Paper text:
[name]α contains two folded domains, chromodomain (CD) and chromoshadow domain (CSD), which are linked by a hinge region and flanked by the amino-terminal and carboxyl-terminal extensions (nte and cte). CD binds to tri/di methylated lysine 9 of histone H3 (H3K9me3/2), a major epigenetic modification and a hallmark of heterochromatin, whereas CSD mediates dimerization and associates with various proteins through recognizing the PxVxL motif, also known as the [name] box. In addition to supporting the establishment of H3K9me3 as a recruitment module for [name], [name] contains a [name] box (KAP1Hbox) sequence, which is recognized by the CSD of [name]α ([name]αCSD) in biochemical studies.
To determine whether conformational changes accompany the complex formation, we obtained the crystal structure of the apo-state of [name]αCSD and characterized 15N-labeled full-length [name]α by NMR. The β-sheet binding interface was comprised of primarily hydrophobic residues, such as I126, I127, A129, L136, L139, W142, A148, L150 and V151. To determine the role of the β-sheet interface in oligomerization of [name]α, we mutated L139 and L150, identified in molecular dynamics (MD) simulations, to glutamate in [name]αCSD and in FL protein and tested the L139E/L150E mutants by NMR and MP. In contrast to WT FL [name]α, NMR resonances of CSD in the 1H,15N HSQC spectrum of FL L139E/L150E [name]α became detectable, indicating that mutation of the β-sheet interface residues L139 and L150 disrupted the formation of higher order [name]α oligomers. Collectively, these data revealed that while [name]αCSD forms a dimer through α-helices, [name]α oligomerization involves the β-sheet of [name]αCSD. Overlay of the structures of [name]αCSD in the apo-state (yellow) and [name]αCSD (pink) bound to KAP1Hbox’ within the larger crystal lattice showed that while the protomers [name]αCSD1 and [name]αCSD2 of a dimer can be superimposed, the protomers from the neighboring dimers were oriented distinctly differently in the crystal structure. The orientation of one of the neighboring dimers in the apo-state structure was opposite to its orientation in the complex and overall, the neighboring dimers in the apo state structure were not superimposable (Fig. 6a–c, only one protomer from the neighboring dimers is shown in (a) and (b) for clarity).
Author numbering:
A (entry chain A), B (entry chain B): 114 to 173
The structure:
C-alpha cells in the first residue's frame, strides 16, 4: 500500500525524477516520515497547489 | 492589456519572471498573439494545469 493508496493527506513534494521514463514526485505525507514516489500526473490532478509550491520553491 | 480580464482561455505560459518582486507569467491566450503579464498567484488558482505544464516542460 504505497503513495496515494496509503490514504494520507499530501503535505510537500521534496523531489522529482523522470529517470524511469515517467515523471515521479517524492511525496511527504501528513503525519508520517515515510516518503513515497507518486506519478506526477496523478499529483498534478489531486494536489495541484502542492505541485506548484514544489516548482515555485525550485525556482530561485 | 487586461490579462484575465480579457475573458480568453489561457493557452500556454511563454515564460516567468520575478523581476518585479512578485512572480509573474507571460501568458499566451487562445486566439490572440497579444501576450500579457499575469501574477503567478492568479494563474495558480485559475488555471493550475497550465502553470504545471509550463513547469513540467521547463524541468524537461
Amino acid at each position: 500500500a504505497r503513495g496515494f493508496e496509503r490514504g494520507l493527506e499530501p503535505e510537500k513534494i521534496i523531489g522529482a525524477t523522470d529517470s524511469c521514463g515517467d515523471l515521479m514526485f517524492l511525496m511527504k505525507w501528513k503525519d508520517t516520515d515515510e516518503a513515497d514516489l507518486v506519478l506526477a500526473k496523478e499529483a498534478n490532478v489531486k494536489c495541484p497547489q502542492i505541485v506548484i509550491a514544489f516548482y515555485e520553491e525550485r525556482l530561485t
